[PDB]
Design a protein around this ligand. Sequence first.
Ligand SMILES: Nc1ncnc2c1ncn2[C@@H]1O[C@H](COP(=O)(O)O)[C@@H](O)[C@H]1O
Ligand SMILES: Nc1ncnc2c1ncn2[C@@H]1O[C@H](COP(=O)(O)O)[C@@H](O)[C@H]1O
Ligand SMILES: [Hg+2]
Ligand SMILES: [Hg+2]
Ligand SMILES: [Mg+2]
Ligand SMILES: [Mg+2]
Lengths: 274, 274
Amino acid sequence: DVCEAAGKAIYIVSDGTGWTAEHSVNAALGQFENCLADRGCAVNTHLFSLIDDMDRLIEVIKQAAKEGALVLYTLADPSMAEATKKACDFWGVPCTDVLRPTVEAIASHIGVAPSGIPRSSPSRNGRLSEDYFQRIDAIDFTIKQDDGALPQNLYRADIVLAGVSRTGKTPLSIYLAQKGYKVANVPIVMGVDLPKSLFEINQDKVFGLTINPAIEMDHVRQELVHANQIFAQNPSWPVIAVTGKAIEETAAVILGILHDRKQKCSMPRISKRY
Amino acid sequence: DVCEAAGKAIYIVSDGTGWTAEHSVNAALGQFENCLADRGCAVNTHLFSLIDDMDRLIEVIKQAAKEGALVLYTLADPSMAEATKKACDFWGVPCTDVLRPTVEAIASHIGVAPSGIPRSSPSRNGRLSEDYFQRIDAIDFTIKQDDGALPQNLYRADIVLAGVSRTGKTPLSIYLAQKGYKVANVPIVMGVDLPKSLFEINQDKVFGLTINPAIEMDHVRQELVHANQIFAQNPSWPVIAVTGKAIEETAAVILGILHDRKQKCSMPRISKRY
Ligand SMILES: Nc1ncnc2c1ncn2[C@@H]1O[C@H](COP(=O)(O)O)[C@@H](O)[C@H]1O
Ligand SMILES: Nc1ncnc2c1ncn2[C@@H]1O[C@H](COP(=O)(O)O)[C@@H](O)[C@H]1O
Ligand SMILES: [Hg+2]
Ligand SMILES: [Hg+2]
Ligand SMILES: [Mg+2]
Ligand SMILES: [Mg+2]
């Protein structure tokens, strides 16, 4: 009958997709990882994309009141944001414009006032960048790849991941292609030789990956040892320990190094023009 | 000599990865899409991951002063955040804790005070969820798939994308597998029959995709017409127009529908337990 009282809920609300807030919510939730570990505290997100008129907005907020739930939101229209906290007050519910701070900080620093317009809007909709179209050609490169045509790919790639089977290359490699880097994976396995071309390419784009064994078929141990022999022989390769680390962390490590080198610099950092 | 004066810069700084702020920055930048279109206003992001001690932090802020650049930041340690705005003031530079709002809103609503601890921290590091390990098995499902074994996959999939070649299935399908949905792609092409199994599966998980032709090898036109015949015959399939729309938008549409149906509800929304 009802598809969902208590268990503190968090409403996520946007005139666009919800993904920004979703993120920032998720990141915030790390600050309460410890009580959540026993389900002592316990939460539910609820995403409302495309909340881009007054009528929906009120229905939502009302509903969020009926549910007893905090409203994190992101609305580009200033009056829509005014309305939100007003009508939240009227229903007696908490809220927070998660993005306005960040928009206004930028607006002063650049010295230009906001569009005040969602991405949803009819006007200025559908003109996509040359950045976003590299990410496609990257995403393509990275998935469309086999054991029998590495040699060529290793030269074309931007990042290259060498490692044991049990490291997480495919997710990692895809996550980086999302960011716009062509990645090639090279499994390190006992019995097979690595391609000559792995070593004839630029060695500053190759990254080792390895599991910590702690955190009987312990040939696994052997395969790790074997790997490190290879990594030893190639000292210029960073060698990242991935077990426990999440893809997005490990990805940041790699990109940090990859950029530090790419533009040799006093201060090491990852930069995009706009 | 120098690898980077003017062209208003934005520093992004975090005790973890930078990705949250990166996002929220990027989202904010939509509010100035119009002046940026002519490079009238013009910006540079700079990401500093793992800024998790005082010494780095100061070096960074100093550097950011030397560069003449706004500092958006995300630091879980309260005193590190205090330091940041203090030392920004001392160098005479703008700043903004992009996340604190959102952390504190949650903290009051749940009624628990923050961890005050980065993800980087030695303590409470490396315990990963059952959510994150589905996303892997999804990411795996979605890439590891061919023309000659759809039938089985179509039953196992959570989402299924039917459409013309020129729609963007592979990126979209991967983007959803990142969110933890097993996606199967089914190209609609003139000359080939679709698999019987496409129609014998649950029809509430199939989503059409189509290009608007506007926004001679215009057989392309024919292939589109042909597609709509198929979509006509299957009215229960949503049919999303993807040209101009970004993957993350189109993904939100789909997920909205997919969830609205999955848990039939008064109010339509996407929900995760924690
Ligand atoms: N390219 C863009 N143009 C205009 N507004 C945007 C753009 N990207 C993000 N936004 C806005 O910033 C917020 C981002 O939320 P979301 O779209 O859910 O990630 C929404 O209020 C969007 O309308
Ligand atoms: N699982 C987590 N545990 C503790 N802190 C987190 C977690 N996820 C994100 N954060 C914090 O929230 C901010 C997110 O930034 P980022 O890690 O760059 O996306 C950083 O200050 C992180 O330390
Ligand atoms: Hg409020
Ligand atoms: Hg400041
Ligand atoms: Mg949002
Ligand atoms: Mg961050």
